[PDB]
Amino acid sequence: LSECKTGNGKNYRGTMSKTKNGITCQKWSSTSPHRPRFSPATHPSEGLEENYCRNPDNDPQGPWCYTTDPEKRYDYCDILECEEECMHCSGENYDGKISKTMSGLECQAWDSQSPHAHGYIPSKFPNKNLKKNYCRNPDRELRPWCFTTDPNKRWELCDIPRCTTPCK
């Protein structure tokens, strides 16, 4: 179940419980410090649950909570856009669109079974994002990768960009 934002965040449903600035959020179904305009009462099916981040009002700036700080009512929250640029760290996360290995071989689709038998079945690891055949890192491996369509190369890693040019 999806842990990153697309567009203004309507369908966001990760579990970020704090504004862009540290402050832990107010549960949506509470009244102190503030009194909110979207109660799981009023806008029921709008993922208004827990204290997690949400965009009920269809805000331009996206997902946002009310802060437990009486002093600033509500504020926005941080939340990686989807798609992906460059891997963060070793990118246990990577949700990007790259399909050609280091060697430079186009990846074999996760869905597929050729030219290689493999148990990385997306069915089996739904949250794991085995889209088409985008390079990935399910298993705490060095850096994402795939099973390559060169029948003699099972798999190998790809050359994903580090955003900030073990981990820090």
């Binding site: 493999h118 148990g119 990385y120 690891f125 794991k128 399910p138 298993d139 705490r140 491996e141 099972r154 798999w155």
Partner: peptide, 24 residues
């Protein structure tokens, strides 16, 4: 070892283990 991890862990190892054995 149930869950993913146990599982992935294993896959990975299996891979790792197999490259291991081709470079040889």
């Amino acid at each position: 070892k149930l869950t993913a991890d146990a599982e992935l862990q294993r896959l990975k190892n299996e891979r790792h283990e197999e490259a291991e054995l081709e470079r040889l």
